[PDB]
Design a binder for this molecule. Sequence first.
Ligand SMILES: Nc1nc2c(ccn2[C@@H]2O[C@H](COP(=O)(O)OP(=O)(O)OP(=O)(O)O)[C@@H](O)[C@H]2O)c(=O)[nH]1
Ligand SMILES: Nc1nc2c(ccn2[C@@H]2O[C@H](COP(=O)(O)OP(=O)(O)OP(=O)(O)O)[C@@H](O)[C@H]2O)c(=O)[nH]1
Ligand SMILES: Nc1nc2c(ccn2[C@@H]2O[C@H](COP(=O)(O)OP(=O)(O)OP(=O)(O)O)[C@@H](O)[C@H]2O)c(=O)[nH]1
Ligand SMILES: Nc1nc2c(ccn2[C@@H]2O[C@H](COP(=O)(O)OP(=O)(O)OP(=O)(O)O)[C@@H](O)[C@H]2O)c(=O)[nH]1
Ligand SMILES: Nc1nc2c(ccn2[C@@H]2O[C@H](COP(=O)(O)OP(=O)(O)OP(=O)(O)O)[C@@H](O)[C@H]2O)c(=O)[nH]1
Ligand SMILES: Nc1nc2c(ccn2[C@@H]2O[C@H](COP(=O)(O)OP(=O)(O)OP(=O)(O)O)[C@@H](O)[C@H]2O)c(=O)[nH]1
Ligand SMILES: Nc1nc2c(ccn2[C@@H]2O[C@H](COP(=O)(O)OP(=O)(O)OP(=O)(O)O)[C@@H](O)[C@H]2O)c(=O)[nH]1
Ligand SMILES: Nc1nc2c(ccn2[C@@H]2O[C@H](COP(=O)(O)OP(=O)(O)OP(=O)(O)O)[C@@H](O)[C@H]2O)c(=O)[nH]1
Ligand SMILES: Nc1nc2c(ccn2[C@@H]2O[C@H](COP(=O)(O)OP(=O)(O)OP(=O)(O)O)[C@@H](O)[C@H]2O)c(=O)[nH]1
Ligand SMILES: [Zn+2]
Ligand SMILES: [Zn+2]
Ligand SMILES: [Zn+2]
Ligand SMILES: [Zn+2]
Ligand SMILES: [Zn+2]
Ligand SMILES: [Zn+2]
Ligand SMILES: [Zn+2]
Ligand SMILES: [Zn+2]
Ligand SMILES: [Zn+2]
Lengths: 190, 187, 190, 190, 190, 192, 192, 192, 189
Amino acid sequence: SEEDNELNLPNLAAAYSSILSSLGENPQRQGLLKTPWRAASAMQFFTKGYQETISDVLNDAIFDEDHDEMVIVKDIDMFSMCEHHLVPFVGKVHIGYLPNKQVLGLSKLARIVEIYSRRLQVQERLTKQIAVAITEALRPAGVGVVVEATHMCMVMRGVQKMNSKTVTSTMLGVFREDPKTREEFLTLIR
Amino acid sequence: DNELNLPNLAAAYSSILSSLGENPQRQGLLKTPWRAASAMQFFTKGYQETISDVLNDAIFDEDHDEMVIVKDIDMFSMCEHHLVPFVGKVHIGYLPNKQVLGLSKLARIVEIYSRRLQVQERLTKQIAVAITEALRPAGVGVVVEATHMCMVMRGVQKMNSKTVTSTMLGVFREDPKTREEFLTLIR
Amino acid sequence: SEEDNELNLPNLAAAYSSILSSLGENPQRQGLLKTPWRAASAMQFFTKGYQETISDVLNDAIFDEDHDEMVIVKDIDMFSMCEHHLVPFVGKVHIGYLPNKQVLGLSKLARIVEIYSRRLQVQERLTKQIAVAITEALRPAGVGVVVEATHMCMVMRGVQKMNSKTVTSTMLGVFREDPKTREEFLTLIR
Amino acid sequence: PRSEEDNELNLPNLAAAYSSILSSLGENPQRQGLLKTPWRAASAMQFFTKGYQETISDVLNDAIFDHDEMVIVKDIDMFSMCEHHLVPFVGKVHIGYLPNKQVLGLSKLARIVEIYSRRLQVQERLTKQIAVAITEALRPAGVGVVVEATHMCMVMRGVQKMNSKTVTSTMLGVFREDPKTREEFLTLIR
Amino acid sequence: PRSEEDNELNLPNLAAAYSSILSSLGENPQRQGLLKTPWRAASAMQFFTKGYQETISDVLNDAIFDHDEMVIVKDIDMFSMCEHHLVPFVGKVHIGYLPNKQVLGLSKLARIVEIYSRRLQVQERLTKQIAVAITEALRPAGVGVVVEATHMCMVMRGVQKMNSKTVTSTMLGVFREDPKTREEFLTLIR
Amino acid sequence: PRSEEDNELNLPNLAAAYSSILSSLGENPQRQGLLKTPWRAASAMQFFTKGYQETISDVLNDAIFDEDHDEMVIVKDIDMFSMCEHHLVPFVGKVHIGYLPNKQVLGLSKLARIVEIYSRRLQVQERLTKQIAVAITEALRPAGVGVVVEATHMCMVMRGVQKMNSKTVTSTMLGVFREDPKTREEFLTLIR
Amino acid sequence: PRSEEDNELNLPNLAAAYSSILSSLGENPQRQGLLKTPWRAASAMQFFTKGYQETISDVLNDAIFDEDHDEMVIVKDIDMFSMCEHHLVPFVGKVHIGYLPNKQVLGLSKLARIVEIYSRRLQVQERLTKQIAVAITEALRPAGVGVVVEATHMCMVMRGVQKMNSKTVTSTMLGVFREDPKTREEFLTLIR
Amino acid sequence: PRSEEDNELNLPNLAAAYSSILSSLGENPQRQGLLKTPWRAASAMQFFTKGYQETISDVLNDAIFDEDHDEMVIVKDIDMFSMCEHHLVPFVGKVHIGYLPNKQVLGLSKLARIVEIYSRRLQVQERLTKQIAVAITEALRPAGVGVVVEATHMCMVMRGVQKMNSKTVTSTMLGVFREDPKTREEFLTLIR
Amino acid sequence: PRSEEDNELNLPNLAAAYSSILSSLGENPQRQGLLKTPWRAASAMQFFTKGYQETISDVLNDAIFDDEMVIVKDIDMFSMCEHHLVPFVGKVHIGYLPNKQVLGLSKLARIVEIYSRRLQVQERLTKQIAVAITEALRPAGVGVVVEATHMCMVMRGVQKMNSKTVTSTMLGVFREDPKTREEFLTLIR
Ligand SMILES: Nc1nc2c(ccn2[C@@H]2O[C@H](COP(=O)(O)OP(=O)(O)OP(=O)(O)O)[C@@H](O)[C@H]2O)c(=O)[nH]1
Ligand SMILES: Nc1nc2c(ccn2[C@@H]2O[C@H](COP(=O)(O)OP(=O)(O)OP(=O)(O)O)[C@@H](O)[C@H]2O)c(=O)[nH]1
Ligand SMILES: Nc1nc2c(ccn2[C@@H]2O[C@H](COP(=O)(O)OP(=O)(O)OP(=O)(O)O)[C@@H](O)[C@H]2O)c(=O)[nH]1
Ligand SMILES: Nc1nc2c(ccn2[C@@H]2O[C@H](COP(=O)(O)OP(=O)(O)OP(=O)(O)O)[C@@H](O)[C@H]2O)c(=O)[nH]1
Ligand SMILES: Nc1nc2c(ccn2[C@@H]2O[C@H](COP(=O)(O)OP(=O)(O)OP(=O)(O)O)[C@@H](O)[C@H]2O)c(=O)[nH]1
Ligand SMILES: Nc1nc2c(ccn2[C@@H]2O[C@H](COP(=O)(O)OP(=O)(O)OP(=O)(O)O)[C@@H](O)[C@H]2O)c(=O)[nH]1
Ligand SMILES: Nc1nc2c(ccn2[C@@H]2O[C@H](COP(=O)(O)OP(=O)(O)OP(=O)(O)O)[C@@H](O)[C@H]2O)c(=O)[nH]1
Ligand SMILES: Nc1nc2c(ccn2[C@@H]2O[C@H](COP(=O)(O)OP(=O)(O)OP(=O)(O)O)[C@@H](O)[C@H]2O)c(=O)[nH]1
Ligand SMILES: Nc1nc2c(ccn2[C@@H]2O[C@H](COP(=O)(O)OP(=O)(O)OP(=O)(O)O)[C@@H](O)[C@H]2O)c(=O)[nH]1
Ligand SMILES: [Zn+2]
Ligand SMILES: [Zn+2]
Ligand SMILES: [Zn+2]
Ligand SMILES: [Zn+2]
Ligand SMILES: [Zn+2]
Ligand SMILES: [Zn+2]
Ligand SMILES: [Zn+2]
Ligand SMILES: [Zn+2]
Ligand SMILES: [Zn+2]
């Protein structure tokens, strides 16, 4: 909740101030005076998806169109946080679905990405949660989700493989059972 | 209808300027109620058209059954939920059944439905249904790719997001080989 | 103000409902029922720059540095509204400046773009307001601002020149007086 | 300079602060995906700030060889940390210099980027420090440094301008005094 | 100037001439595919030369507003007819100008391209006419016009140089006298 | 077939018609830039329709070789320039041809020459596309032929609908290129 | 496995061999630019072959998660630097790995660490490709693994055939990646 | 096979023929720029046809390894320079080779050397494509081989039809590359 | 200069050193996949350093023919870092303004081969190409730009995957006249 955010902000700032001292830095120097608070607020914003529910995000934007054709929202910018290192992983989400007389509002597909990506995560879980949320909200014939991301933990440190990218895929309903629907989806997201 | 409704549209746009905190009397805004009203009538000019007039009897005989595609047709529509543009491209394919449509008419058909208050899904289906009813072909495939400004300039603000809708009728739905040839040739 | 927005929202919705009827549409059909309110909110968001002042936007993010080298923030996505047709014009803003004793917070250069772009505008005025705001806030040796935009009024209607783009340029202080400074700026924004 | 003994001693304090952040965000620090996170996040942050453990003399490692023509090392991948939000800023560094009978080892130019980028920083300071370090180590006729970076604090939050990039430039010696040397440098780094 | 009355009076004469061309080429004007061709070719030709029906004053439509900046409208799609062979030449027009107290409506620069390009022409004349029309309408400090076009007379026939392109340039006022203004224009139209 | 003698005899009639068009458009046929136009436009139009002067037999010129070759042959990116028969305005693009020989192999250049016979006429894309495929089929008797034509029609860009980016793609698949989807897929993959 | 003590003991022997190579090439090991070369070349060669010092278990470091996922996971564009065992000249490129988990998901970075164990050795592209796929299969027991290696061999560009654009692509498909063409096709579509 | 002794003996005859060509074109063989041309043109033509001096066995040089690899091996983007037998004008491009080894794996560079044996001759694209595939098939006895050649023929761009962008693509699929479409699809996807 | 007799006498020494290197790395130089490696590695190293055998006069081969800019750009270059004995590869772009003599186009690339096929440092290699052209033709000026990826900076050490080194040498009018140098740099893009 927003009350939880206000109550936990000083605790987060104290932890960030302690990190600055433990790294050998001077929390009292000009450039670092407001850093405990700004880092705490940024981390709250990066994890704002914990504050959201699918019902509020959908906001009744479910329409009735006699549509039994493929709908895709691709190149949705995604910014998440690795739960192992607390370092960002960023990329794109491509979503496809085959409606079953209930059609979702286009923007709501990107809002669903925001609920789960703005959390401490792993790409596999994030990919599956987006597909399951759309499946449960719309009850469509099928859903396909592809996430492509650069993990900063693999480029700025560790293995330091500058070009590496992780691609995760989740195919539910007809997107799993019918290879032709999955192939049309993968062709159209290029 | 356009001439009669132009002053009502201009009165509504002038009222919007005042309600936003702007000064409708300032030099840059004096003609805005009229220009905005004319622009909105042009963006919704598809309501003035019928398929028959647009086709203009441009249907010719072609005995050999080959796939015909008109791709990269620039499309400019209006979102019916926010009254903000959604723009992109339409790619149309069909397999004739002895009748072939005039090439330009495929783009004119896009103009009838796109120049209206719409939703991408309905727009995509209308183009495919109009071609199906006009030509009675073996099948039709329509792919619409668009940037909705309501998802980039506001709301979710996902700068690169694009919506892709597809409608496959007749052999384009029943035969995956026909649909695959269409999708390969529109790249 | 936000109070002005709440008070004027029903008047904006009434005007948008009237526009739906005047276009030949049915405001009672499912797809249009909430449109007067949604269009009103979208228009208020597109013109939220009238709710801001340079001082609040700057938020005292002016640092003292021994930096007398070129600073550029380029490819700032910009979304504005043509004041003549009430149709969007969108593109990018590239800003460069040579600090004297004060250096502005990087994000404030993009926030300055937001104060002026979220208004009913003309590209030339927008370009000049960004350069003047930076000049008055920082008193630098010079500022350069380049705005490149697609006007939907020239693409979706009127002349209908699909590829046309407007580029405006404002060069102040050393960016006007010293061609070498302006050339370095234009080379670095490519 | 920060030592490896300081790192071992401060690691538990950093881990305690990161565990506290996990709890203050509303997360479950006992869940499988978070069990080792306090330690992994602490190690990642020590690696991101390893530049405090280095000195120019150790980094140079006597790699100065006995030429008065332009030498450039461009597209050096750079990963830094914003000191205001503790969020990465990443991109590229392009360095050019005109030797004065002493040529630096090519790799040492990238190692100099590492000393200063692996710290809590601001782009302007980082750009100046690289140019000054090369100037003091080699005493060349001049040095030019261009840093281009995406600040995640401007993409994942705040203004959320997905394409925004910051470009900073420092020109010293003949790179400032002679526009022809600076022009050759900027042409060759494209 | 040519009028819709002249158009309707000359349409049967144009159609008779196109029918005669069909017979003189060895074709059968009575075959299904050619029956309406004399009329459709005649209408297309009078649309390609619709520029003779226009005047600068009507096209400007008083869209002159009351700046210290370079204004450019680039990538204006241009379609003209070669006067020597009556075959299209197509490409792009890039216009730049420095206003002197009067600023022209953005779309009018593209409308000015339409008056002169929709005629039987030579590229050099078309380029000069656009620059002269802007100069006389606005009285600016200077104007620069660059036209790049593929002549179908050089690709479909004659020399048959598939990739050949003609680039013509006209620089007036400060765009001719000040190389710095011309260089800024050429850099910004890339 | 149209002859060079027919061209000489009809040139003055074409020039008179083009001179008449100049006057009917409001132009001055006597101005310097237009003096030679009736003749130059007439010659250009005869060159654009020179395909009526040619035969498949003359164009092939016996360039049919024998071989134990049963592998795919493609000539792609053949620049094509044609004239729309409805508006007498160019349509331009590329032709991609594939075929599976049946012991007879056509000379590589002849595939582009076949494109020239039919494209240099008053046409429609669909007719042009089948004519190229049918000519190859009848000349070689191969296992199959595939023809893909991609073109920009200037009548859809410079006028009418004015859709700047629009392109027409027509496809003709005969023999094994129609019956075997695997052969057609190899062809479409290799022409990218 | 090779140890850090073995590296310290063998460093002078490697330096003596590199100093001998400098003399045998006609160079002067005493000139300023070559004085430290025997030691730096020796250290670089030990770094290029550091994969002999590693074991899969240490490299994995228990980064196997037991959070179910029955969907395709790919780590593509992993920069790869190896050494040809026949010429002792580098071959460099990228590795693209895909797998279908069977209730065990590997840490993303470990897939790149697996590439490092085998590529930092004297190798042959075919063996390298197979070792990465086998190591993942044995560590995770997944439904299947696919590995694609694309590399420029400097032995084919700087010498020998001297084909400057040549690239070698090797592929290994195990489990469902071999048995189910639909799984393999999804993998190859997603690595583009 | 043509020998280096044959080259020395025939060099004056080639130079006499090239000197005669200079005179027959209206040129002056005595002008400074043409004095050595008969000899340089003769040496260049011998180099362009040096493939007649080679045999598959010498080129392979026993570079056949018995590592039992059951996975796809590709060498793509092999620069190819050949000579059209019909006009004596170059045709240049790229060769992409794929194979599935059975019990024998060929040395990577030998696939490019096989391209050199056949391309450095007076050729026709179809024959060249087939020869490369048949040589690999006979040398290794693999499960299958796929060869794709893409080339620009200067006879179709500098003269004749003068289609500046035209490209010829030839394909040969043997063994499992013909019988299994899934193997052929993996090959064509991996050579993009 | 290095002779073919020196190559025959020194090839054995290089092979014995590579065999010793294989053993010192923990490998088995007796295993099937390494049996021919000492000889192959020795031959590859001789090929990479064949430039010490070449003289400018032999390479030129009298290809000098009897006042506008001439450029040969995108010359593929493969050299060896003298500090680590690892390749550095890229492109060389050469421009010159002839006086009365014009060199044969290929000789500019053959001059790149003389100096690049040696143990080098990019700076020296760039200068040696410009000086060789200057001394052979006595032109009004020469400009040389070398762009290279050093494998010692990507496969090891700093491991900066995208890093590139660009070195430049401008002699005669290419140094003295900035307009000549600008024409050269614009034309090599
Ligand atoms: N499957 C999956 N895995 C994920 C994330 C995010 C992170 N991870 C992975 O957790 C592992 C942690 O291992 P560890 O304890 O050994 O840490 P550490 O020494 O710092 O590792 P390293 O990075 O090698 O230096 C790493 O392998 C990392 O990649 C995700 O989205 N999906
Ligand atoms: N399927 C479909 N849906 C369409 C369009 C055009 C628009 N829409 C969608 O109508 C929904 C309206 O929702 P709402 O009432 O909650 O509004 P609002 O708070 O302003 O939303 P948001 O924009 O998210 O801030 C949105 O989801 C929008 O995307 C289309 O073509 N196809
Ligand atoms: N300098 C400048 N000019 C601007 C804007 C925004 C708009 N404008 C321009 O005002 C002019 C208004 O003219 P008008 O009355 O004739 O309208 P209308 O018939 O609808 O025009 P048209 O579009 O041709 O159909 C147009 O030329 C338009 O382009 C800007 O940012 N900078
Ligand atoms: N010149 C310079 N400036 C730098 C950095 C790194 C960061 N900054 C800038 O410090 C300012 C601090 O502002 P603030 O206190 O108001 O914070 P906050 O509300 O979170 O801001 P915001 O991001 O707008 O939400 C911001 O403007 C930020 O951009 C750098 O390298 N160079
Ligand atoms: N400066 C200028 N020149 C222009 C145009 C348009 C056309 N032209 C040129 O008039 C010349 C007429 O010559 P001509 O009589 O010999 O014609 P013709 O034998 O058919 O020629 P060709 O095409 O070579 O076969 C041609 O050279 C043509 O290119 C333009 O915009 N600017
Ligand atoms: N299938 C096919 N159709 C072709 C060509 C070439 C042209 N055409 C098409 O003939 C139709 C004629 O219609 P019409 O009489 O109404 O003309 P007109 O008012 O001038 O039309 P418009 O252009 O819309 O303004 C148009 O649809 C045009 O596109 C081709 O190759 N294949
Ligand atoms: N399959 C496979 N093969 C590999 C490597 C690495 C190298 N090789 C290949 O071994 C062969 C050695 O033969 P050889 O004795 O004739 O040597 P040499 O005269 O120097 O040859 P060449 O280079 O042509 O001059 C070459 O064909 C080389 O390419 C690999 O990873 N996979
Ligand atoms: N299948 C195949 N065909 C090949 C080559 C190489 C060349 N050719 C083709 O031999 C034909 C010879 O015909 P011809 O006698 O009529 O000559 P000529 O008048 O000069 O022709 P043209 O060029 O049109 O002027 C041409 O069609 C040429 O393309 C190849 O590799 N594969
Ligand atoms: N100016 C110049 N310098 C060149 C080359 C080729 C190489 N070098 C540079 O010699 C230096 C040697 O340093 P060193 O002793 O410390 O070795 P080592 O610890 O292994 O280094 P490192 O690689 O950092 O790990 C490095 O800086 C290397 O880059 C060139 O062409 N021009
Ligand atoms: Zn991580
Ligand atoms: Zn909307
Ligand atoms: Zn407007
Ligand atoms: Zn920050
Ligand atoms: Zn012409
Ligand atoms: Zn037409
Ligand atoms: Zn090798
Ligand atoms: Zn030929
Ligand atoms: Zn090195």
